[PDB]
Amino acid sequence: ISRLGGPNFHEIPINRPTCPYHNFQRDGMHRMGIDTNPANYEPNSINDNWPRETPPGPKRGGFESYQERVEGNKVRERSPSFG
Amino acid sequence: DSLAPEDGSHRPAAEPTPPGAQPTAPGSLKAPDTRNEKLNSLEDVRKGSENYALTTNQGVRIADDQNSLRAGSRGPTLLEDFILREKITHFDHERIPERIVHARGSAAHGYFQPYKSLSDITKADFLSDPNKITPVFVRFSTVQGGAGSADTVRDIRGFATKFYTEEGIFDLVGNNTPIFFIQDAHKFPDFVHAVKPEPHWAIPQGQSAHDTFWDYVSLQPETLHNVMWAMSDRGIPRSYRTMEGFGIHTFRLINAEGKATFVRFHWKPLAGKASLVWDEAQKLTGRDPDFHRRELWEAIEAGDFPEYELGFQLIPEEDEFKFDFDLLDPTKLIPEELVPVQRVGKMVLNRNPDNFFAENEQAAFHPGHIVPGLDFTNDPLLQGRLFSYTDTQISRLGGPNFHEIPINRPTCPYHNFQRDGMHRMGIDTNPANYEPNSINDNWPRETPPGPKRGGFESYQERVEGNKVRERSPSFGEYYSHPRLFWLSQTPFEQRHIVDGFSFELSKVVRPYIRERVVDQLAHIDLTLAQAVAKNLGIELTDDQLNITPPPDVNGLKKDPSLSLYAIPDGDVKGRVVAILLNDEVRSADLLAILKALKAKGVHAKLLYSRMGEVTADDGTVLPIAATFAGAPSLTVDAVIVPCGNIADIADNGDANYYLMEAYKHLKPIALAGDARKFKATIKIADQGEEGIVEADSADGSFMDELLTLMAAHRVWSRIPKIDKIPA
Amino acid sequence: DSLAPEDGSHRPAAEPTPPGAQPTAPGSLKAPDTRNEKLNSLEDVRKGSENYALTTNQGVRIADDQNSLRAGSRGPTLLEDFILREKITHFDHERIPERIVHARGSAAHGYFQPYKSLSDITKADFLSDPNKITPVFVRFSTVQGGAGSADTVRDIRGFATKFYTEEGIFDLVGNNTPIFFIQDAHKFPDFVHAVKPEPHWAIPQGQSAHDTFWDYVSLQPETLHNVMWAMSDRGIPRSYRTMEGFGIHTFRLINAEGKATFVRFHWKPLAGKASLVWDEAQKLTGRDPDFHRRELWEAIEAGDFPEYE
Amino acid sequence: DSLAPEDGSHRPAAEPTPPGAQPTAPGSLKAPDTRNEKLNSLEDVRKGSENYALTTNQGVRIADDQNSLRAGSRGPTLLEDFILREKITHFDHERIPERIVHARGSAAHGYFQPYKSLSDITKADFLSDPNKITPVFVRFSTVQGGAGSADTVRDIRGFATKFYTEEGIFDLVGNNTPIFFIQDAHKFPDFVHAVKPEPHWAIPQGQSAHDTFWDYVSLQPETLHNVMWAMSDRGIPRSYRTMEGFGIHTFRLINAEGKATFVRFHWKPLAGKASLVWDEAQKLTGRDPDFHRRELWEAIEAGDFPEYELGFQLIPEEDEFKFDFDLLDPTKLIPEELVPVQRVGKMVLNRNPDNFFAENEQAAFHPGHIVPGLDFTNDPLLQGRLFSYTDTQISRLGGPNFHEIPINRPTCPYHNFQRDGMHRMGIDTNPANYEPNSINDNWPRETPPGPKRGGFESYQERVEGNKVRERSPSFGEYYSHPRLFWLSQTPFEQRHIVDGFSFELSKVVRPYIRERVVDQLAHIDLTLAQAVAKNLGIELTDDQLNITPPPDVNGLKKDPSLSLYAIPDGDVKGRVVAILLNDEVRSADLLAILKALKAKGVHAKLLYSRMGEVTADDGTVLPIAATFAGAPSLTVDAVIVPCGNIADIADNGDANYYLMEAYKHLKPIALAGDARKFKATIKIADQGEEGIVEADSADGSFMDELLTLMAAHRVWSRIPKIDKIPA
Ligand code: HEM
Ligand code: HEM
Ligand code: HEM
Incomplete structure (x- = not known):
């Protein structure tokens, strides 16, 4: 920034x-892309919800995080294993 | 040099003055x-x-x-x-x-x-x-x-x-x-x-x-x-x-x-x-x-x-x-x-x-x-x-x-080891800009958490679950709290909600969107749904008519804290009244009016068709604050028209509309003596009606009826009348 | 998906229309x-x-x-x-x-x-x-x-x-x-x-x-x-x-x-x-x-x- | 806490100390x-x-x-x-x-x-x-x-x-x-x-x-x-x-x-x-x-x-x-x-x-x-x-x-009607932010020009001509002032100019560019031209050999103010000398050396092969400032090697190079007693030569010869010798 x-x-x-990127982010300094989408929010019916979210899959799917288990308290503390 | 007027009038008084009495x-x-x-x-x-x-x-x-x-x-x-x-x-x-x-x-x-x-x-x-x-x-x-x-x-x-x-x-x-x-x-x-x-x-x-x-x-x-x-x-x-x-x-x-x-x-x-x-x-x-x-x-x-x-x-x-x-x-x-x-x-x-x-x-x-x-x-x-x-x-x-x-x-001290960045004002004399350090003996130092003046430490809440981008099922209910809000409204408050939705929705160009919003309202309350629907020319489907209403909120059926007007509380202090002058105003009326207002803390604007000043019947000079068109009824809380030479403003379209706009916006109107001629403008029964204070002279009781209406903010009972008025 | 109304009404006609006849x-x-x-x-x-x-x-x-x-x-x-x-x-x-x-x-x-x-x-x-x-x-x-x-x-x-x-x-x-x-x-x-x-x-x-x-x-x-x-x-x-x-x-x-x-x-x-x-x-x-x-x-x-x- | 050493040594003395004696x-x-x-x-x-x-x-x-x-x-x-x-x-x-x-x-x-x-x-x-x-x-x-x-x-x-x-x-x-x-x-x-x-x-x-x-x-x-x-x-x-x-x-x-x-x-x-x-x-x-x-x-x-x-x-x-x-x-x-x-x-x-x-x-x-x-x-x-x-x-x-x-x-007042812009620090209380104004009676005001404390007024120079993007013909001469500069240089100063051009030009990859720069030099002075040309393997054309030199500058043939060394002026104060220690340094030599330097305002660096401290022959402890490799000759003005156990540093490649670099860079070198062994390193006649001060012991005259050479900055007479040295 x-x-x-x-x-x-x-x-x-x-x-x-070098691959496509489309989303509903608009404006900001030296904005080069002129967006022709009638919508700049989702969910929307007026451009029939495009661009759309993609489910996770084996090839060409959406990003989904690995569901690691987290348990502990909110602590600012170094793990003893790092000692 | 000059440019300033001597008589000193370019500078405001350094003391509390009413609205518009001085330049700010x-x-x-x-x-x-x-x-x-x-x-x-x-x-x-x-x-x-x-x-x-x-x-x-x-x-x-x-x-x-x-x-x-x-x-x-x-x-x-x-x-x-x-x-x-x-x-x-x-x-x-x-x-x-x-x-x-x-x-x-x-x-x-x-x-x-x-x-x-x-x-x-x-x-x-x-x-x-x-x-x-x-x-x-x-x-x-x-x-x-x-x-x-x-x-x-x-x-x-x-x-x-x-x-x-x-x-x-x-x-x-x-x-x-x-x-x-x-x-x-x-x-x-x-x-x-x-x-x-x-x-x-x-x-x-x-x-x-x-x-x-x-x-x-x-x-x-x-x-x-x-x-x-x-x-x-x-x-x-x-x-x-x-x-x-x-x-x-x-x-x-x-x-x-x-x-x-x-x-x-x-x-x-x-x-x-x-x-x-x-x-x-x-x-x-x-x-x-x-x-x-x-x-x-x-x-x-x-x-x-x-x-x-x-x-x-x-x-x-x-x-x-x-x-x-x-x-x-x-x-x-x-x-x-x-x-x-x-x-x-x-x-x-x-x-x-x-x-x-x-x-x-x-x-x-x-x-x-x-x-x-x-x-x-x-x-x-x-x-x-x-x-x-x-x-x-x-x-x-x-x-x-x-x-x-x-x-x-x-306004309290802040010292830390952050340096540089655009329009950096502080010149740091610390020989260190990192901790831990021995060269400035570790200052500024961390403080332990304590009862008074200690360091910030977060509350040690327990977290267990997986990394998920997922909404909690407890958030899944969308309709009982809008219906609790709706049921806690006075009747004219609810009218005003119907009319808010109907105006906004009339401005959507695409009709399927308006229908989609009425469907959602029918899940909240059908009365609400039917009222809005009607103003829009939409019919509810018998299935929409058979949507089951949401549950109560912990068995609560209404809470009056959610309404603006149900339990009344009202400042009359700091409110503002417009007084419509004419060229021979009766001072008897006027000094009574202004004394009453001053005792309650209410501000007056003396308004005429011209700027400058008029002279009361006893030769008092009154400076005019705005014209009728310059400070519309829109900007005050009540209108008082004292007696005097009424013939002067009676034929004036601005003075008459000033009253019709105010009437329609449900404000108190007070008419003293011949000023009661204007009843004929806002169409009132000689027998009178609520919210129009009228009398032979502006006096103590006339002002009491007015300040009492004012503490109640608008005359809600007039809402049936105001539909026939063209203003 | 839906969200769009079929009958097509969410999209304006790509031709001159009068004031307020279509969404702009x-x-x-x-x-x-x-x-x-x-x-x-x-x-x-x-x-x-x-x-x-x-x-x-x-x-x-x-x-x-x-x-x-x-x-x-x-x-x-x-x-x-x-x-x-x-x-x-x-x-x-x-x-x-x-x-x-x-x-x-x-x-x-x-x-x-x-x-x-x-x-x-x-x-x-x-x-x-x-x-x-x-x-x-x-x-x-x-x-x-x-x-x-x-x-x-x-x-x-x-x-x-x-x-x-x-x-x-x-x-x-x-x-x-x-x-x-x-x-x-x-x-x-x-x-x-x-x-x-x-x-x-x-x-x-x-x-x-x-x-x-x-x-x-x-x-x-x-x-x-x-x-x-x-x-x-x-x-x-x-x-x-x-x-x-x-x-x-x-x-x-x-x-x-x-x-x-x-x-x-x-x-x-x-x-x-x-x-x-x-x-x-x-x-x-x-x-x-x-x-x-x-x-x-x-x-x-x-x-x-x-x-x- | 600790982190700071007590003995206080992390903080510098708040008083003038020599170079490197304290942390800055x-x-x-x-x-x-x-x-x-x-x-x-x-x-x-x-x-x-x-x-x-x-x-x-x-x-x-x-x-x-x-x-x-x-x-x-x-x-x-x-x-x-x-x-x-x-x-x-x-x-x-x-x-x-x-x-x-x-x-x-x-x-x-x-x-x-x-x-x-x-x-x-x-x-x-x-x-x-x-x-x-x-x-x-x-x-x-x-x-x-x-x-x-x-x-x-x-x-x-x-x-x-x-x-x-x-x-x-x-x-x-x-x-x-x-x-x-x-x-x-x-x-x-x-x-x-x-x-x-x-x-x-x-x-x-x-x-x-x-x-x-x-x-x-x-x-x-x-x-x-x-x-x-x-x-x-x-x-x-x-x-x-x-x-x-x-x-x-x-x-x-x-x-x-x-x-x-x-x-x-x-x-x-x-x-x-x-x-x-x-x-x-x-x-x-x-x-x-x-x-x-x-x-x-x-x-x-x-x-x-x-x-x-x-x-x-x-x-x-x-x-x-x-x-x-x-x-x-x-x-x-x-x-x-x-x-x-x-x-x-x-x-x-x-x-x-x-x-x-x-x-x-x-x-x-x-x-x-x-x-x-x-x-x-x-x-x-x-x-x-x-x-x-x-x-x-x-x-x-x-x-x-x-x-x-x-x-x-x-540090003096500035008031005007400029407002806003990023990280605006001044909060302006003026009711006006434009002039002319009557509401703050025209303050801040314009001041007439005068002898003291008046407004800025430009000098009323006369301008006549047309709107032209054109260079004045009076600017058209490119060569007499470079030749005046050249002729005002001592001979070794001019050498150094020849060598500056020859180094830079050797780094141009495209040879036509180098030839083009030598042509230009031949319009300034042919000696300059021939010297540079030679280092580059370029031959001057007989026509280049027949370019007529530029005119004098108002009949001036040289001005010595344009040379650095022709009329001498020299601070010895604030200069720095390196003293090469060994493990049994003769204190007689050392206290004489340091007293002399201190009287003239010159700073010493005691240098060894290891950090820590050595002990003079009388048991004095000397703290080492840098190693020979840590503070090269490059950073001092002269080198003094006192007597003592010379055998210690004599075989050390760093101590010997310290002297060869310094020799070559035309600095004064002073050798007391057995330290004169190193003459054999920098190849000096037993008979001696200028710029090498040598003696049986460091004393008053030895130091006088040294400070005198130092006021003259470099030993220019050595320039013929230094070409055979590999350092
Ligand atoms: C309970 C919901 C929220 C409340 C009550 C709230 C309230 C406010 C208020 C009162 C301001 C005005 C600041 C000013 O007067 O200078 C403000 C500014 C702003 N809010 Fe919110 N906000 C809410 C949610 C959000 C969310 C979800 C975001 C961002 C993810 C957001 C981002 C901002 C930003 C970026 C500004 C301008 C910030 C600034 O100028 O410093 N707000 N908000
Ligand atoms: C007689 C010729 C010139 C001299 C003696 C001169 C000298 C200097 C000096 C000493 C600085 C350093 C400022 C600092 O230490 O912060 C400087 C900065 C600068 N000069 Fe020059 N300059 C010359 C010609 C030019 C010309 C022709 C331009 C522009 C058309 C120029 C543009 C600048 C700019 C933009 C900076 C950076 C400015 C800043 O950081 O405030 N200079 N100049
Ligand atoms: C005959 C008098 C003037 C006319 C007809 C004029 C006209 C305009 C117009 C039409 C714009 C709008 C630009 C846009 O639509 O993006 C503009 C912008 C602006 N004008 Fe003027 N102007 C006048 C005098 C001045 C003067 C005296 C100054 C400065 C000394 C000035 C400074 C500017 C600046 C800084 C902007 C904003 C510039 C920009 O956004 O690119 N104008 N002016």
Whole structure:
């Protein structure tokens, strides 16, 4: 946000995905993409909910985190195993 | 030189004056002696003017401030005019980014003071001694429109308080309704995008009456409780002084023994609750877009300071699952009938800023600004907010040193090993800028947690579960709390909700969206559903007619705390009355009227068709404050027309409409003597009617009937009559 | 999925419709075939939507866009939710500084074309051949209020035209009255400070009816010609289509032999001149603050294109 | 706690200590009592540390500053750790943009004081009374490399002085050579692009020895005078204390009667002029890249304050066309033989900063920062500069309020009607922010021009001509001033110029560019041309051999003021000597040596092969300052090897090379008693030679021969010998 001037650093040409990216993020300094989508929020009926969420799968699916188990208290404390 | 008028009239009196009696001023100049610890510490950055030479920012005095440096008086401007280029460069760069939400906003200075020590429940120093008063800075705001938008729009208002405490800044950032629209912070961008101006053409401003707003509401039934509030009269307040404030999340109070209590924060308006009606509120954004900014500035200059009670809803940790709604759900309110608001202290706003940009526009408020004695909960909307308000300052306020901007500075010490960043004001003399260190013997040092003046330590809540992006099933209920709100409304309050939905929905261009919103209403209450449906030409399906209503909230059928008008409370003090003058006004009437008003604390505006002054029948000179068209009925609370030469204003379209608008907006109208001629205008029975005070002369009882109606705010009984009036 | 109504009613017809007959749309979607050289070159940065997966800015598709990553469904949000933090960071930084003057404003695309060659008076290529049409972008504006202010206020309106010519951009930045308030640019900050909201309390918005404005007018008699214009019906127009435009300075036209001609530029409204009356204009900023933005968008969608000479 | 060593050794003595005797400190802590008016006014933003609790920027004390908030000690970090996110956000945003040129740079605090009143020539208050001392802030800099580049590179150095005067800030922004490379400011971007790292790969750093530099020189003959200076020893100074400074443009002094005088500004180094030699200077950027930053900080801590004389070259307006070079040409110098430098006052630098970023990195200097009594001329490079240094601050320093950053603030009043902009510190209480105004009775007011405390008014010079982008024909001569410079050099000075060009040019990959630069040299002087050509394997064309030399400069054939060494002046004070110890050093030698040095003000470094301490033959304990490899000969001025157990260091490769490097770099070497064994290393005749002081014991005369050689800086007579040495 300060080095590269703002939330659109991914539009600076070296940093751009060579694959598609579409979502409902709008505006911010030196915004290069002109969005033609009538909606900039989901859920929406007016552009029939596009772009849509994808379920997780073997190939080309959405990102889902690994469901690791967490148990403990809220502590600012170093694990004894690091000692 | 001259330019100033001698007779001194360019400067306001440094003492309380009524609304519009003087030009308004900077705080310091109007109230030199209202001080407090934050106000006194800003003294190091206040700049004066008088008897000072005009200079560049580098201290060089300017001889000609009217002309550019040109080669001959009709020739070209030279690049070496450094005086011109500095003056136009600072102009070129005046504007910073506005708040991405809540950009509109109005602020004032004042203090907080506790009623008693709350040491038994929290180890928070600002609440530890009734004798400890705390400097606050408060900014009231709207939510949708930009900083140039109008004040009396239909919207949620924000209410943010900065507490300059001895152990850190505590910001309590809340709004004026007790639940929010969204459960999870991940959806905040989609909701704000849907309320906001539409992307292709940036319309509308300051309004939710547009398709995308209502599209997202119909597809998201959790937004429905807070949309009910915004659709009520609660969405158009009379003043920032006449509204409640709420922190909306469940937080924790931690005492010195480690015991945690859940709490929800309230602000109770000591002037009563009161709102405008929509035709009034909408027309007034045209007639005066700064009405709420203006009237706050002027209540404080008249000494009608705003006051609020801080109030806690405390719930023991054991009762965490005693209700049939989840306490960590931000779309659920805790009925005061189930849990009472305990009054904890009082806040008084008694000083305006000197510079709006400097003090108000550069103020940063963030909910993560908590002190020892307070802590957070797992509320999913509170957890996300925590990320956001540090982040946003890096562009709004240019960088990581926004706390050095003077309104935002702790009045207590802060020392740590953070260095550099844009417009770094502190010059650090510490030989170390890392800890642990031996070279400055480890200073500044960490402090252990303790009962008073200790370090921040988080409450050790137990966490067990898997890493899941998933909503708790306890959040899954969308309809009993909107129906509890609906059932707690007076009948005319509910009318006004029907009419709020019907207006907004008439402005959706796509009819399937409107139908989709009526279906949702039929899950709340069918009467509500049928009323809105009718105004829209929609028929309910027999299946819609057979939807089973939601359950009660812990067997509660209504709570009257949720209504604005059901249990009455009313400031008549600080309200404003318009008096319609003519050229031979009867002074008998007038001195009686003004004495009565003055005893109650009510402000008058003497209004005519021309500016300047008229002369009462006894030769008294009365200065005119505005014309009838200049200060419409929209801006006062009641109209009084004294007797005198009535023939003068009787034929005047403006004077007559002044009364018809006021009638329709349900305000008290008082007619003395021949002024009763105007009954024929607003169509009243000679026999009289309620809310029209009339008499042979303005006197004691006439004024008593008027101030009594005024304490009741509007004449609700007139609502059947006002439909036939064309105004 | 559904969410869209089938019967198709969520989408507007891609053809001229009257005011309020359809929902309004993006230009490309409402008028797929109005093209010009500037419009076609923006094609490289237009982004579509349909049939596309929702992603992060780095191209990673999102499976759940409704929830944050928490340790248990009633637990705390985790700092490793990079999907949530990207979505809220771009939100946190949406807003750039607004124009320090003329912040309100409404714009449209179109073209310019000369009646004949003006080669005898100027060697300016955009005016050299009646057959050469030039892409323009035009923004109409007010002067005092912020971008969130109302459209039908009493004020001077701006009229700025960007000419995408074969030899460079020519911007003709003018207003709707033919003289300005100030003679020298050194005073511009003092005049704009005096019209603007007052420093202590930031009132009023979109209005000159306040002391400081009229203080500086009474002390500065050169402001009086243009104050007369602003005080006339000329200060409350019916539409951006119903007003004149002016460059206000004397400029020079230089032809190919080196001869210089002084010139003043005008824009003549082919729909006629028309203004509101003040009670109307003032009440309308309450009733519809976007009236001028709205009606320009809709004249162009109905095909009632604005034209000027 | 502990962490600090008790015995107190972590803190430096707050008094002058020699180089490397103590750890260095913040200014305030090392010199609590060097005060001045600018230093005292920064007191409001200095922050201490001791006995203070570690806090957030919002004042909340931190209990654990070692750990993040995680759900269990091996679990994930929680988004609600606001203490962690504030600490890492300020880190993430530490860096501002660096100066687009002159980014390297080192600064100090001090004062200026006039010798007498110059009221007869200028109405400038800082020069009006010999009793008026003025706070200055000075930053010395290089030109090409980034802020992370090395100090002893071959380049032009900058010399910028901020004068905090009673009537405004006067910035005198100059460099260390008297002419610039370019005539017109329009070409500044092309020249800086050509010197700078090349665009494709960003090489080289801190060097002009690359193709594009020399490409633009060969195509632009106006750059040749200042390239001659950069190619001389003038381009590698020994210290910022040992160089001249120059304003380069002709300016105007305006007195109280309106008379204008042209002036050129000089700074004369009261320590003498002295430079490194290139192998030394280049190797030293590897061995200590901070050598110039270090040695300035330490001269000031030892109390060897830098001092300079401000000197004026005054020329009456009538003599504007008396020379055969245009006075407004920035590539032409005015020979001191034609116009003398009159010494006007003195400047002393006597206090270091407390925080480099805050004070040094945020300092803004701009030549348009002039005061009443001074004015500009039509110099085309001065006119363009005027645009630039206001502009650049809007991104470097984030905005139009850089003058509020504490190092940059006027110590005198400044009031005007400029409002808002990013990190606006002043809260303006003025009811007006425009003039003319009646409501604050027109304050702050314009001031008429006058003799003392009046407004700025420009000198009414006559302008006639057409609007033309055209260079004056008077600027058209490119070669007599480089040949005047060349002819005024001692013979070894000229050698060093030949060798500067030959090294740089050997690094151009494209040979046509090198040939093109030799052609240009043949227009200056053929000897110069032939010497460089030879080192490069280039032959001059008989036509090149027949180029007619340029004319004299007003019949001047040489001026010795342009040489560094021709008229000698030499500080031995503040210089540094290395003493090579062994394990049984003869104390007789050592106490004589150190007494002698101390009487002259010279600093010693006792150096060994190991750290810790050795013991003299009488049992004295000597602490070792560095190893031979740790503080190379490169960093001292002379080497003394006392007698004692010589056998110890005699076989040591480091101790022997220490002497060969020093020999080669033309430094004085003194050998006492058995230490004379090392003559065999540096190959000296038993009969002796100049610059090697040798004797049976270190004594009075031995030290006298040494300090005398030292006042003469290098042993130039050795230059024929040093070619056979492999070091
Ligand atoms: C219970 C719900 C919420 C309440 C009561 C609330 C209240 C407020 C208020 C009163 C302000 C105005 C600040 C001012 O006057 O300067 C504000 C600003 C803001 N809010 Fe919220 N908000 C809520 C939810 C959210 C969420 C979920 C986010 C972000 C994920 C958010 C992000 C922000 C930001 C970025 C600003 C502007 C911040 C600033 O200018 O410092 N808010 N909010
Ligand atoms: C004949 C008098 C003037 C006219 C006709 C005029 C017209 C305009 C117009 C139409 C705009 C709006 C730009 C847009 O729509 O984006 C504008 C912007 C602006 N004007 Fe003026 N202006 C005048 C005088 C001045 C003066 C004297 C100054 C400065 C010394 C000035 C400074 C600016 C600046 C800084 C902006 C905002 C610039 C931008 O956003 O690019 N104007 N002016
Ligand atoms: C006689 C020729 C020149 C001299 C003696 C000179 C000297 C200097 C010096 C000493 C600095 C360093 C400032 C510091 O220490 O903070 C500087 C900075 C700079 N100079 Fe020059 N300069 C010359 C020509 C130019 C020209 C022609 C331009 C621009 C058209 C220019 C633009 C700048 C800028 C933009 C900076 C950085 C400014 C800043 O950081 O405030 N200089 N110059």
